[PDB]
Amino acid sequence: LNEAMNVSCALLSSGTGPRPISCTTSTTWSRLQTQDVLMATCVLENSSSFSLDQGWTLCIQVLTSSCALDLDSACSAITYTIPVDQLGPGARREVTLPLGPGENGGLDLPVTVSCTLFYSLREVVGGQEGVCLPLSRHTVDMLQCLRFPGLAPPHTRAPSPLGPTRDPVATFLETCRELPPSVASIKVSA
């Protein structure tokens, strides 16, 4: 518990740039069999000496789109909970967890990754309860999801993706039952 309090004090106070603990989030494009998918590297780093022993965990939660809609969709969010193993001073670990279009093109995009820590004493010994420290709220824009295949460095012959044709359930519905470019702009003072 002493270690936990020094750590919590380090984290919450000292409103500076370098925190003792950090969690940088990148984004990346990977191939899954043939598909493209979006990936989130979450990288937890420990710049301090505090080897965060047992009863620390790492709670990531990924909300796809935050708005109230009537019909209730199958995945508001997804959550992960890796146990952290003392983590050690100066160390860092990396966690790739994909976000990608899990449906046929089914991808609404303000998807947000958030990382949190959680400490429970009841784990080591009780006497219960616990404490949730919030670390990062990262967001993923659409400016991140662009990949520019043509201007890309390699200039290599990749097939064009041409995402799935309307829905494999759409196809089902057609068979079983048988333009200008849109633009937007802003101006702003130099």
Binding site: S66, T81, V95, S114, P134, D167
Partner: protein, 273 residues
């Protein structure tokens, strides 16, 4: 989310949980509705010490506030599970025989564990009641008394243990939701449903909400944006009586942007369908 006990698992691997929210109206025919959250996960990676304990952590985050101010974490009790516990039932829902659903946690464990798919139905030039026959005579449904908007098909064929719901708003149009144990059954079901309907009955899949509701959303978003821009111009127009403070222009453009992001959200929802 679900946290395993570290002292148990010396080896660190990941954990997953899909959050499905479930709104069910209770006797709408105020009148109590029921919102319940639910997570879902794989057993067999946890039972590798015959017994496991998991804490249950319920976060709440605000939308309105862009300051990340409010993280009301909660710790909602603690679950223990052992292989002796399973050996004697005690927690399982296993089909046939435990049919007469009279512990609504049984209904909800269904609605959560089952793949969900929503469909809007329209019969423009024909009133639409043949759904209630396809449901009540063909599929041989059982209505759950506590929640009379949900139908559990007992027909002992291949689609045994599939749940519908059916909101018949404006009896031309209706909306039907299919909870199933895989996607083969969901296709086996759609085929049988299309077979019964009229020739003109136009199905449609719904990703992200009902067309009427998303139009109301788009309408609301545009209305607020235009009202806010009229407010900008009225702020200028009273300043015409009083050359303008660029500070005011900036202050108002911020709120206009904050509403525009919502109109653009409603617009993408409308413009994908």
């Amino acid at each position: 989310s679900l946290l395993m006990d570290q002292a148990h698992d010396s080896r660190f691997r990941l954990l997953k949980c899909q959050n499905r929210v479930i709104k069910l109206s209770t006797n709408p025919f105020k009148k109590e509705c029921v919102q319940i959250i639910t997570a879902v996960t794989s057993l067999s990676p946890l039972l590798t010490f015959s017994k496991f304990c998991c804490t249950v952590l319920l976060q709440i985050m605000e939308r309105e506030s862009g300051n990340c101010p409010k993280d009301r974490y909660v710790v909602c009790g603690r679950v223990f599970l052992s292989l002796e516990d399973l050996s004697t039932g005690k927690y399982l829902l296993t089909f046939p025989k435990k049919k007469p659903i009279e512990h609504m946690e049984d209904l909800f464990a269904l609605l959560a564990a089952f793949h969900k798919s929503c469909f809007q139905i329209t019969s423009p030039g024909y009133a639409l009641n043949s759904m209630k026959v396809w449901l009540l005579e063909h599929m041989k449904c059982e209505i759950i008394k506590e929640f009379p908007e949900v139908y559990f098909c007992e027909r002992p064929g291949s689609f045994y243990g599939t749940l519908f719901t059916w909101k018949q708003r404006t009896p031309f149009e209706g909306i039907l939701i299919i909870y199933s144990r895989n996607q083969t059954v969901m296709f086996q079901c759609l085929h049988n449903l299309i077979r019964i309907l009229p020739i003109n009955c136009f199905l449609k899949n719904l990703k992200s909400g009902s067309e009427n509701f998303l139009i109301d959303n788009m309408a609301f978003t545009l209305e607020k944006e235009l009202v806010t821009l009229s407010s900008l111009s009225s702020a200028i127009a009273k300043h015409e009586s009083n050359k303008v403070s660029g500070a005011l222009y900036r202050e108002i453009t911020l709120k206009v942007a904050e509403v525009q992001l919502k109109s653009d959200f409603a617009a993408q929802k409308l413009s994908n369908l």
